[PDB]
Symmetry: D2
Subunit: 359 residues, 4 copies
Amino acid sequence: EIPKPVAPAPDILRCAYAELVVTDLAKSRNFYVDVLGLHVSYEDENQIYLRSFEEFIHHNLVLTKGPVAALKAMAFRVRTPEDVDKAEAYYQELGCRTERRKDGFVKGIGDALRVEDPLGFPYEFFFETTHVERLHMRYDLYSAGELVRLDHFNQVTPDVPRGRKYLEDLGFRVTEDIQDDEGTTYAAWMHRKGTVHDTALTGGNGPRLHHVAFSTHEKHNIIQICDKMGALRISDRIERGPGRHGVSNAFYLYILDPDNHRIEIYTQDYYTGDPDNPTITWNVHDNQRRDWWGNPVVPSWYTEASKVLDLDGNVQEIIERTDDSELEVTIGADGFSFTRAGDEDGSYHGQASKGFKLG
Amino acid sequence: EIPKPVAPAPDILRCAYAELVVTDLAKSRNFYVDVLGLHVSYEDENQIYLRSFEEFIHHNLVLTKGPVAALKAMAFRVRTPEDVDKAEAYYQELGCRTERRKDGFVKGIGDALRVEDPLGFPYEFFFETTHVERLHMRYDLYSAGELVRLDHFNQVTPDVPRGRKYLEDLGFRVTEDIQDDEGTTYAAWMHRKGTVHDTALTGGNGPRLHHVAFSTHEKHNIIQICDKMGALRISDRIERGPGRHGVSNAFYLYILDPDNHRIEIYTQDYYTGDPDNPTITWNVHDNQRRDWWGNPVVPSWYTEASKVLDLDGNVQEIIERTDDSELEVTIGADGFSFTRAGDEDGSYHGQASKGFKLG
Amino acid sequence: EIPKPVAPAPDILRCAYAELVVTDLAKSRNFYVDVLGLHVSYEDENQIYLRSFEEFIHHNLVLTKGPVAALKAMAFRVRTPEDVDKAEAYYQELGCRTERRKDGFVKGIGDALRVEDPLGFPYEFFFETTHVERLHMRYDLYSAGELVRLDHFNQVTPDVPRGRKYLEDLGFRVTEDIQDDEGTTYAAWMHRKGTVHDTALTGGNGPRLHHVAFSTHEKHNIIQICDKMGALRISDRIERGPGRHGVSNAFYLYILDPDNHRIEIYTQDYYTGDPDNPTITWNVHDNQRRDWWGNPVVPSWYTEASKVLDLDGNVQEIIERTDDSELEVTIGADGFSFTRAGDEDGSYHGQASK
Amino acid sequence: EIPKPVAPAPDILRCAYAELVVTDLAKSRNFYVDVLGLHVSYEDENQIYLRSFEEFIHHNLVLTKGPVAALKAMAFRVRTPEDVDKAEAYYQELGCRTERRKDGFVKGIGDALRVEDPLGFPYEFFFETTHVERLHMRYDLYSAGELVRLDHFNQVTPDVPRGRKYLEDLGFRVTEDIQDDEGTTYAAWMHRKGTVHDTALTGGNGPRLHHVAFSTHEKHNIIQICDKMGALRISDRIERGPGRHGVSNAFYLYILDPDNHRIEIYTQDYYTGDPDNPTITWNVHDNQRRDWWGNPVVPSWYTEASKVLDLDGNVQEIIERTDDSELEVTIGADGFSFTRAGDEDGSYHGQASKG
Ligand SMILES: O=S(=O)(O)c1ccc(O)c(O)c1
Ligand SMILES: O=S(=O)(O)c1ccc(O)c(O)c1
Ligand SMILES: [Ca+2]
Ligand SMILES: [Cl-]
Ligand SMILES: [Cl-]
Ligand SMILES: [Fe+2]
Ligand SMILES: [Fe+2]
Ligand SMILES: [Fe+2]
Ligand SMILES: [Fe+2]
């Protein structure tokens, strides 16, 4: 277990941006700008800085050209300048490598701390950022599929309870989780900003980045993204969805960028800001937990995720999960799922729902 | 091959209602009224008469208690009383069994002709019907999933060109179809009322009734039906969808009633009323033809459909399709489909899209 | 009264396009293409040809540069080539001025008849048209405010019953109307294509064109048009709405183009294709008849409308309505409306609602 | 000016519920339950306890039968039980009348502090509340007009800067306001929970309660409320909207309950939780500031608002605003508004927009 430091945790506001390394900057720009409609704050031959419709900080996504596609940083904004100092002390007490840059790692961010966290993930904490034009009423620019906010990250890690405890000490509150009756946690969701989550842990080999998620206003905006991908004849880049989540109650879609980085589009989860917010636990065999309508979860969703980098820019080595696999226990050969607890009718033995099996 | 009569075709307005035989009237009522929110025009211990939100004729659906669940009649309204006489002469010239009842077969319909048509289907033609309160502005009744119109039927028949020719002579115009490069037709859609279809032919063993379809106003209304079925813990009765169709461009969902009769919910197809309306032909291997987003078509959608009755109430014998099977050529072990014609990337061989094979 | 010809009526499919004369083509292009997102089928220095998202015929709207903004033609598509001959014989029997151009009046239309109709309106009938790419699945082009179909026209004319009977003889069926207990007709809606209308008559001084209407898929698409006009700081060109109509039950918005031509955006009316489709008559004093939510109808909506041209391109003289005025009897000094009939609570006297 | 206490402010989470006094409990039930679809947590012959679709605390609205329709309490939830102690100390230092009940004033709330605040409003602060079934996935119950959350209160007060300073000291952050070029403030919006607001101040004679606001998921849910009101032939209880707000950017509707308490339905404002969230100031003459589409604001929206009670349950006396009136300066006989700053075209003199 990861000890609770004596040093106070930084006051984290929210997820703020991700830096993704991409192999072909022009192909990635086509995806995030021409397909998805994100707004360009800055670009050059090496990077593209993108933001959502309602954002006022400099960016929500930095695309950085490099040799190996990977997550380079997942950044959280803290409440005050002094919280960056607290972050450095906190992670130092945890025994983690840290790097501090007074003028930032990326453009439009000031004083910033990056850390190799105890789960092997590159976290950034910052307060200072260049404000830009907030585009929230620029309906002259608004797309039929407009991405309005950055909502969350989702991380793949082999030991969910170990990670959960560490994030709770850092001040994240768990809103929902998936467990079974034999003591295994498969996934947990945790927040600072008062939505279902700012980050989440998914059980699996890791550290890897499962996805970054953006919000829309309405469900039809997500439908439009699907429709547009069909018109562009890139429906093969729709991985899973659209659907209604069980966990989070959000309407959702997962798509894959040119380096196979997974992006979720998400809308209409619920308020979690009260400190005694009720924590919802789903059983791993409940076939409504991930897709409320019971649609099967494609195997790539469980197996595939992005590499993450260390502070030197090298790929983090992957540690195998030894706990039970959500894929295996639900849709694998000895898997099981139910529609109604205790009812054989609507249950699935050794295959996925709706008439499918693993490819 | 079905000859064109010398007798003039009746002028058909639209699909108007279906009579479905159901085995447990109370369970069927729970589904169509309590789950789906259709409006009761009349009911007793033997039948329930149901209509959509915007309908003014007596009903769109009659549920008739009987021993064997089946389609008993699919009914089309004709333009004038005289058109019922025309239908009788037309089908008599075709050599079909007919039955005329001056006071109707079901309540709220007057002079009506039922026929066992050349494809083995029980068609009804009528003009006279009892008008009811049109509920189109009854927003005090309006459900979050409100079904607003009857849109179409879909019929399974072994020889699609044979049926298509016959329906063309009856005045239906083909709007879309699905073919391969070697001259096999897998499906066709055809209309009278100026939408994509009033009925459609799906290649397969038949006669069987594939589905009846109702419309909603908006896409979110279809989403709500899915959400409600999740809340009722009957997500196992969601068969396929929700999705965007390729053919028709409509947003859709398929669900299964207590006797496994398939119901489609459908919205936002396009106007076809001009006589030179451009026909659209899709290749059977195009993985965007049925679901525009590339989501896989569940095998049950290809294989399962309702029995139909003859005019005595006995089940019609099934005749096997000898032309190629859409299931087998697209998602079976020797099947294939593409995202982009000629492109290996985004193509699927011997399995369905998105990472599944047949269960 | 307009006699019924012995000559058979042309079989009219639907409203198909309008040709509007505009005074500044570039300003009009900015409104219809950059603001509203219509799709260009052809343009040059004199004209812009535009179509909606789901259209396959050449255009739904022709903008033609000219000295005086006006309606130049409201065009209906007919079922067959021979229906253009029928239209010519029909209007000739009516005594109307007609002009036939075997190669069309505008690009992308072939053999076409224009008439000065008995109500003074420039109608076109055509079958032949150049097919174009139907954009209905081009979601890469789809706007948050996308206009998907041309739905209808609305005509201002002084005597509604006279016009109604003429249109019924042409095969249009009345779906809804507004009347009072004294027997005055204020407005009527009538169709060929199986929606609430292809054209409509509004009682007033005419001939004038009240509006041209386009459809969207959903209500949020109409909202987005309003939001976009706010962002462009042209909210003064939102005239009325957004709202729910009583008549038609459609969700709606009215906006004004740079020459003050009124454009309605409209969605989700009901099917009318059965020949005994029930006709709905509203009372003129029912404050839910025009806006179901009881929002007031601004006077400009009743009084302002576009000039129309004759076949020479000159402005048609206007005839004053002598029947009672809907404006005067509902929101004028001696007017009134109710929310619930017979209830003084929620009634309005000598003023509009809200 | 209201002094800043030495005593630390309580940590306020969010607006949580309002207690409204109503005259005919059955008629109010029909409005809030049958028309609007709120969910009953508890009822008897004296009170109805209602909650929104996504709520887990006991209620968002309490309807209490009484002789005079009024706001009895606007309640904010605080972060810990100790924050109720902090609230008590804070308001006592301000010289405000307070009353603390360890077992609450209404059912489903535990230890609670009510105060007559420096602006004359009845505030409640509480932590302890009875959890109930969260209905957020009960799509078997979901209405086409479903109200999903409580969003905010709006208060009418004569001196907006005075109130703004007091609320800032209490930890609310101003997100948007309306001012003119002559030093007058007409309205301010301020938050704790990271939306545009938990409460707002509207300049006018006060203390009165302008409205209570509930959220929907989507814009069509608000349109449905309007459509249903038309079908019920009660469209005369739609006061203003539906519309898009300028301030807040939310889609909105205002309707009137049987005692004329004003309810707003609201959706799709933006995130404000960062502490340097950019403040937006509108000019009072900007005709897109309240309705972005330029639709006129009816005079009743400016003039009418609910009485509020003191801790003894008596109506607070109304103090007259002496600052300029937003009604008068925009839509009165000497009013002015503009569509485009500096453009005579689309401007309005001595009247409201749209004719
Ligand atoms: O699945 S398809 O796109 O082929 C299709 C299109 C329209 C329908 O009504 C249908 O049932 C099926
Ligand atoms: O305002 S009305 O409800 O009378 C009306 C209904 C349908 C229309 O298309 C229209 O322009 C006007
Ligand atoms: Ca177990
Ligand atoms: Cl999931
Ligand atoms: Cl406002
Ligand atoms: Fe996620
Ligand atoms: Fe269908
Ligand atoms: Fe209209
Ligand atoms: Fe408000």
